[PDB]
């Protein structure tokens, strides 16, 4: 609603309006209709063909409103668009079309042709937009019209499964759409104003957004299984690739405490290839979905050592070992968060 409208775009959009309608109606020649009185398409007929005064009003009127909502759409996700050059106002070239096969209205509708302008990957990647936000507007429209999601479409109950998000969207209805508009962004630029794309915006949510607070779960055998000497050994497998340690904890660690972040736990994270212990070093590579990380404590020396996919992981230094001494306390348990 802020937007306000450049001079500029004030002297285009109109003609840019019945322009895209005389093209929107040889859209719809295309699909096969044929003017007539009646409005059921069923029967071939509908009287939207016809010119801008002679369509109904309130088609008239919402067409030119969402040709000024589409632009201003534009100009408000940050891309601005300029004047290529006076020559593209004052040439009206036209495609020859045959009469019988164009509409009845005389104000014959071709643009200028599509094979001349090309549409770059920022701009293909903008009218991905503006079909995200047409359907946000069709959505919202029917929603404050009661219309409700529905598996099965009924009119009867305001019942419509195309009320979904854009993402979930049928491909058929996307692609519709989204040529619509993208033919639409072309025409644009076919009256010479090169809109700017800006340049993609690197966000990344990180995955935090988890179900109310909790960060991480950690799984430990029972404190009554600790070894306090010998060899021990066994296997961590990653169905996915992420936000994982494992390694060996002492009886008093803290579930809600991170592995490694104190000295109850030694643990080794592959995601960022980080081993923990009162600190993060570096240590090993990093794991894909799969893999099977082998942990190994030898608590008769005093060390442990990690396995990834049978490979014996290694630190910045040549040495085999995680964790190279520590005391026996209590014991070791099996852990993995
Ligand atoms: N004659 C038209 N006038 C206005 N918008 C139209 C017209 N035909 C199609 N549209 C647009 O394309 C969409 C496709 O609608 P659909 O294929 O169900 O046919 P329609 O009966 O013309 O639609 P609607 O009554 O919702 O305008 C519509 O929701 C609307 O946004």
């Known amino acids: ?28 020649i295309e699909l096969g209709w044929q003017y007539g009185p009646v409005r059921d398409d069923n029967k ?3 009287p939207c063909l016809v010119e801008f005064s002679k369509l109904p009003e309130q088609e008239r009127n919402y067409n030119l409103q969402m040709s000024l909502e589409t632009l ?14 006076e020559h593209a106002e004052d040439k009206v070239k036209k495609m020859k079309l045959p009469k019988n096969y164009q509409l009845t209205s005389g104000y014959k509708p071709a643009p200028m042709d599509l094979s001349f302008i090309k549409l770059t990957p920022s701009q293909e990647a903008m009218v991905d937009k503006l079909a995200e936000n047409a359907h946000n507007v069709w959505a919202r429209d029917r929603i404050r019209q009661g219309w409700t999601y529905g598996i099965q479409q009924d009119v009867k109950n305001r019942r419509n499964p195309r009320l979904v998000p854009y993402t979930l969207l049928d491909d058929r ?3 519709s759409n989204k040529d619509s508009l993208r033919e639409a962004v072309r025409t644009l630029l076919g009256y010479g104003y090169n809109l700017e794309a800006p340049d993609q915006d690197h966000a990344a949510r990180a995955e935090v957004c988890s179900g109310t607070g909790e960060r991480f779960r950690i799984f430990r055998a029972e404190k009554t299984y600790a070894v306090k000497a010998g060899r021990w050994y066994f296997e ?7 936000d994982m340690r494992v390694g060996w904890s002492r009886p008093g660690c803290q579930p809600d405490q991170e592995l490694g972040s104190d000295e109850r736990a030694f643990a080794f994270d592959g995601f960022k290839a980080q081993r923990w212990h009162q600190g993060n070093e570096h240590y090993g590579r990093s ?3 799969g893999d099977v ?3 190994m404590v030898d608590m008769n020396e005093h060390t442990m050592m ?6 014996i992981l290694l630190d910045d230094s040549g040495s085999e070992l995680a964790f190279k001494d520590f005391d026996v306390g209590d014991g070791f348990i099996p852990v993995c968060s």
Do not use: Y
């Open 1 to 28: 609603s802020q937007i306000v409208l450049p001079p500029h775009l004030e002297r285009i959009r109109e003609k840019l309006a019945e322009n895209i309608h005389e093209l929107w109606v040889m859209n719809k």
């Open 44 to 46: 071939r007929q509908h």
């Open 72 to 85: 201003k759409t534009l100009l408000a996700l940050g891309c601005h668009v300029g004047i290529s050059d």
């Open 173 to 175: 209805t996307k692609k």
């Open 236 to 242: 961590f497998e990653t169905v996915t690739a992420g």
């Open 287 to 289: 794991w894909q979905a």
């Open 293 to 295: 990380v082998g942990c």
């Open 306 to 311: 990690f396995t990834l996919n049978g490979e």
